[PDB]
């Protein structure tokens, strides 16, 4: 049973050095032809190959990131480390380490290279965010407009994730859409949470978004209503 | 470097369908190609290695074929857990490479988005920044394009958008796009428009308002 697990800092600032560790078990890195590679995945984007290291200590790197990457293995601790220097916002991603099988052997003779064509077991992945920002609570602003009507709350400029948003202290759930946050160039996150309701109930039912950003101890309740009193 | 193009990038399907996804390499990679399925919030899982070998513990409905430059993954009878994103990976040349992925979601009837535009709050304007948001609610398929216009000038590089995961009830998607301007620039313009293009709209729907108009 092979298992791998990534460890490292969840937050790192631009220009700094990121050191990620892959701790594994169920296999030895000194086993023949075996390899361990690193793959990253920026939020919502495709997988991107970073590097791989083998039992004989041969190393290979992505040409695009070559100068900022170093990979090494510590056979005795069953670990593989990846060091990325001078990080920047574009390096924010989930980093995964994965195992690469070596050739099948028979009495010490490799007889099949077929199983090497894949990364067969992967770690859960470690999320790394790159921002210079310090912990900061959001500013909540109303969203109106207003048979289907829409209203919401803009949860702007906070760090780090996550933030919770509910409506009417949890009583309103139907027609609610809390979008994933986007990391702004400023290094702070921003997200909107909206709700669709029958254009009738606005005059009767009240709509309050409950925002909670634990990291900074910020809780806000913002009642939103069709403007003009 | 070598390129892996997956087709189609997005694919609609229902439980029970037979689907096939293709991956084409710009240069021959022999049979060193693998397929993975990735569910949101989880790492990719190996399905097929060496182009057609079935990975141990992987259900028999999955298979893959091809060699050289053309490869296809097929799921004979799709099950609920197959709704996810698939990737191919080439391991013949360094660096190893992944394809752009292909999203497989629950099919449903085309549905145009209900569009709403929101001006910046006077509360935000007092802090020096103006955020204008556009909402595209419950639409399908996922692909949609938002175009911001200010006094008829196409905006570029000053908006950010996010899309919700497919709704488990109605199978639709919602999208939020935020146009961000400083207060000064915001005040120096009058007409803010959100133009939306989507397969469900015979023509682009435009929602807008005139700043300061009260």
């Amino acid at each position: 049973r092979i298992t791998l697990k990534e460890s490292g800092p969840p937050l790192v600032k631009p220009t700094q050095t990121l050191t990620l560790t892959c701790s594994f078990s169920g296999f030895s890195l000194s086993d023949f032809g075996v390899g361990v590679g690193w793959i990253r995945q920026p939020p919502g984007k495709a997988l991107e190959w970073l590097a791989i290291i083998y039992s004989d200590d041969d190393k290979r790197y992505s040409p695009s990131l070559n100068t900022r990457l170093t990979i090494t293995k510590d056979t005795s601790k069953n670990q593989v480390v990846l060091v990325m220097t001078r990080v920047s916002p574009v390096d924010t991603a989930t980093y995964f380490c994965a195992h690469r099988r070596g050739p099948t052997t028979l009495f010490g003779v490799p007889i099949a290279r077929g199983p090497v064509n894949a990364m067969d077991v992967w770690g859960q992945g470690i999320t790394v965010t790159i921002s210079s920002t310090s912990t900061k609570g959001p500013s909540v602003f109303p969203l109106a407009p207003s048979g289907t009507a829409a209203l919401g709350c803009l949860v702007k400029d906070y760090f780090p994730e996550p933030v919770t948003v509910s409506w009417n202290s949890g009583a309103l759930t139907s027609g609610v859409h809390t979008f994933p946050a986007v990391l702004q160039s400023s290094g702070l996150y921003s997200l909107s949470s909206v709700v669709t309701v029958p254009s009738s109930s606005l005059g009767t039912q009240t709509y309050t978004c409950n925002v909670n950003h634990k990291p900074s101890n910020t809780k806000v309740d913002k009642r939103v209503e069709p403007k003009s009193c | 470097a070598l390129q892996l193009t997956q087709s189609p990038s997005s694919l609609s399907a229902s439980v029970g369908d037979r689907i096939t996804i293709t991956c084409r390499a710009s240069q021959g990679v022999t049979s060193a190609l693998a397929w993975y399925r990735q569910k949101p919030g989880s790492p990719p899982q190996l399905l097929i290695y060496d182009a057609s070998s079935l990975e141990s513990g992987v259900p028999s409905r999955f298979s893959g074929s091809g060699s050289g430059t053309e490869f296809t993954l097929t799921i004979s009878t799709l099950r609920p857990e197959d709704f996810a994103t698939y990737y191919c990976q080439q391991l013949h040349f360094y660096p190893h490479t992944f394809g752009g992925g292909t999203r497989v979601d629950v099919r449903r009837t085309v549905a145009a988005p209900s569009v709403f535009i929101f001006p910046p709050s006077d509360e935000q304007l007092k802090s020096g920044t103006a955020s204008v948001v556009c909402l595209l609610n419950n639409f399908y398929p996922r692909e949609a394009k938002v175009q911001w216009k200010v006094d008829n000038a196409l905006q570029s590089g000053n908006s950010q958008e996010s899309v919700t995961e497919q709704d488990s009830k109605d199978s639709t998607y919602s999208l939020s796009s935020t146009l961000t301007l400083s207060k000064a620039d915001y005040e120096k313009h009058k007409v803010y428009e959100c133009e939306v293009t989507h397969q469900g709209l015979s023509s682009p729907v435009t929602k807008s308002f005139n700043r300061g108009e009260c």
């Binding site: 032809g33 390899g35 083998y54 041969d58 290979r60 050739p103 290279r113 090497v116 064509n117 | 022999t30 060193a32 391991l91 013949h92 040349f93 360094y94 190893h96």
Partner: peptide, 7 residues
């Protein structure tokens, strides 16, 4: 270049 197991 070629993968470790290529040829």
């Amino acid at each position: 270049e070629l993968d470790a197991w290529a040829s």
